[PDB]
Write a protein that binds this ligand. Structure first.
Ligand code: K0P
Length: 119
């Protein structure tokens, strides 16, 4: 029932994601010189360095907010892919499975702790 435990759990999960080879296309903001029309298709760019910086700045109040930004990285990859068989999109699918597998207990523990706090 530790209401704050999610933060270090998310830092550790981000560390695993950065070591994952599948995170390579998502570690920093998409380069507009590489993908010139990126902002014509994607309204809200997102990447793992921005998520980590937001977390470290104390600008996430809950793991649900972090999870919304991480899921945005994957939805942006899906929306920008010309085919569902592209290299970058295929990496986002595997990384999304890994992330969802690990974030599930973080979310459950946090929501349980908050329900206990407000009992
Ligand atoms: C990390 C950035 N990112 C790349 C993709 C896949 N998109 C392409 O390869 C592509 C190339 C040129 C025009 N349209 C699409 C998805 N997110």
């Amino acid at each position: 029932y530790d209401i704050q435990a999610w933060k270090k759990q998310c830092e550790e999960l981000l560390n695993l994601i950065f070591q994952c080879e599948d995170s390579e296309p998502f570690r920093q903001p998409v380069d507009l010189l590489e993908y010139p029309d990126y902002r014509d298709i994607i309204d809200t760019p997102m990447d793992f360095a921005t998520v980590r910086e937001t977390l470290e700045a104390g600008n996430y109040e809950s793991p649900m907010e972090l999870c919304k930004d991480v899921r945005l990285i994957f939805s942006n990859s899906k929306a920008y892919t010309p085919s569902k068989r592209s290299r970058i999109y295929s990496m986002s699918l595997r990384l999304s499975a890994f992330f969802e597998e690990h974030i599930s207990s973080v979310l459950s523990d946090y929501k349980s702790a908050l329900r206990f706090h407000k009992r």
